[PDB]
Design a protein around this ligand. Structure first.
Ligand SMILES: *[C@@H]1O[C@H](CO)[C@@H](O)[C@H](O)[C@H]1NC(C)=O
Lengths: 49, 179
């Protein structure tokens, strides 16, 4: 009962939660999932092929 | 111009494809393959139903580059249009252009599926999407563009369901053949 309850990083689709250090401390869900699919899934097929 | 262009990558099929597409036609019905004057001299006397049978057997696969379409001819088209759109200036005609959101090449092949459902060919749908995915890159089907664009529309789930794979394929073709 001091702030919002932090949820743990569930390594799965529909999860991957984190905490945004703003005034309300909200629970977001998925950081840079557009851009961390770019460097991790696009280029990882371009670099090996 | 409604839902179409003079720059869309099926508006001018080439001699590599158009000569192949009639060679592909003469294999369907029992027509002789000798030369140009013999792949027409059977088809100049075929009944108009069995020749439109051989369109549905052939257009249900192989995708948009294997559509029938215009060919560059020296008295009608001096150049492919991407260069030829700059080769034609000082002519005045206003343009009101525009597509729909519903214009998909699955949707333009809605009547193609109906005869394929009539005789019954469930393999003429999963072979149609990959042949559409084969055409999704360049006209030569370069893997460097086909693997690049299949990431961007995120359709690498042709495994269990045709829910997201059939929709996001229509997303991809419409933003390169239409819009
Ligand atoms: C196709 O495009 C629309 C555009 O509004 C988008 O909402 C939709 O999610 C796209 N389809 C897929 C399967 O991503």
């Amino acid at each position: 009962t001091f702030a919002t309850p932090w949820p743990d990083f569930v390594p799965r689709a529909g999860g991957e939660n984190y905490k945004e250090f703003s005034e309300l401390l909200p629970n977001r869900q998925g950081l840079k999932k557009a851009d961390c699919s770019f460097w991790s899934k696009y280029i990882s097929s371009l670099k090996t092929s | 111009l409604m839902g179409g262009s003079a720059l869309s990558p099926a508006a001018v099929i080439s001699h590599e494809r158009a000569q192949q597409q009639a060679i592909a036609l003469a294999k369907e019905v029992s027509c002789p393959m000798s030369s140009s004057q013999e792949v027409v001299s059977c088809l100049r006397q075929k009944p108009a139903n069995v020749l439109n049978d051989a369109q549905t057997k052939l257009l249900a696969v192989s995708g948009p580059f294997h559509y029938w379409g215009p060919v560059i001819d020296g008295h009608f088209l001096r150049e492919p249009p991407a260069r030829a759109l700059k080769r034609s200036l000082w002519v005045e005609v206003d343009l009101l252009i525009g597509s729909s959101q519903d214009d998909g090449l699955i949707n333009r092949a809605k009547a193609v599926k109906q005869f394929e459902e009539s005789r019954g060919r469930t393999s003429s749908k999963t072979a149609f999407y990959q042949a559409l995915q084969n055409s999704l890159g360049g006209e030569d089907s370069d893997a460097r563009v086909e693997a690049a664009a299949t990431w961007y529309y995120s359709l690498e789930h042709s495994t269990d369901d045709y829910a997201s794979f059939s929709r996001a394929l229509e997303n991809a073709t419409r933003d390169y053949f239409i819009i």
